[PDB]
Amino acid sequence: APQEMGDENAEITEAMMDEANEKKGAAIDALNDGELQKAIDLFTDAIKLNPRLAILYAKRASVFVKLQKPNAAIRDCDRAIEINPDSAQPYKWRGKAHRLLGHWEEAARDLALACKLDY
């Protein structure tokens, strides 16, 4: 079953960008507490409010990996890469999710990229 990805063609106000950072702060607080479902919900709220911020999809992917929902992670990473092809985070989580699945060649591809992109 698939997760909410948010409307890619939305008009995004300064107000919405701010509330998104608020939901992100709370998602991060839940994550660090090991309340992982809660973290997903809160990243999902963040994504509906700023669906063009790549870091939000990457963070949610990382949570999906900790929950061992690798396909869900891969969907989030693809979307983050499509917004920002040159940032390291989504390749890392996509590589890790590919490992759970035993997609060894894909995982090494992505993890190799993550290492180079990271600086």
Swiss-Prot record:
Spans through the membrane: none
Location in the cell: Cytoplasm
Highest taxon in the source lineage: Eukaryota
TPR repeats: 20-53, 54-87, 88-119
Disulfide bonds: none
Functional summary from the UniProt entry: One HIP oligomer binds the ATPase domains of at least two HSC70 molecules dependent on activation of the HSC70 ATPase by HSP40. Stabilizes the ADP state of HSC70 that has a high affinity for substrate protein. Through its own chaperone activity, it may contribute to the interaction of HSC70 with various target proteins.
Family statement drawn from the similarity comment of this UniProt entry: Belongs to the FAM10 family.
Subunit and partners: Homotetramer. Interacts with HSC70 as well as DNAJ homologs and HSP90. Interacts (via the C-terminus 302- 318 AA) with GRK5.
Identification of the protein by name: Hsc70-interacting protein
Species of origin: Rattus norvegicus (Rat)
UniProt lineage: Eukaryota, Metazoa, Chordata, Craniata, Vertebrata
